[PDB]
Amino acid sequence: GSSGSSGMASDSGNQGTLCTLEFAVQMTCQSCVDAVRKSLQGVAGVQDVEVHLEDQMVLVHTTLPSQEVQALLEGTGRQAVLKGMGSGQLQNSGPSSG
Numbered sequence: 407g408s409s410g411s412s413g414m415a416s417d418s419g420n421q422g423t424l425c426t427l428e429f430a431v432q433m434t435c436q437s438c439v440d441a442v443r444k445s446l447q448g449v450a451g452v453q454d455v456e457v458h459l460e461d462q463m464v465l466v467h468t469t470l471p472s473q474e475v476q477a478l479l480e481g482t483g484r485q486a487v488l489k490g491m492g493s494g495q496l497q498n499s500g501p502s503s504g
Contacts, residue, residue, distance in 0.1 A: 428490030
């Protein structure tokens with residue numbers, strides 16, 4: 407008799423990409439704005455974070471998913487709602503009618 411078989415699969419998987427995450431955080435006074443920013447201020451992973459008190463918005467430029475940042479944002483005590491998990495701009499060429 408004789409036999410021979412195998413079932414191995416090389417282990418190779420790279421997952422890493424920096425994207426912009428828009429989170430609508432309900433702010434009231436500076437404090438809230440100071441805490442929201444700090445919560446993600448120079449924090450491992452996070453590369454940038456924008457906080458708009460005018461539109462109670464709060465962006466977060468990190469390689470981590472919204473589900474990951476969401477928790478970090480909620481940790482401050484406020485409610486972080488996802489209003490955009492991506493970006494994209496479309497330009498147009500040609501003369502305009504004026």
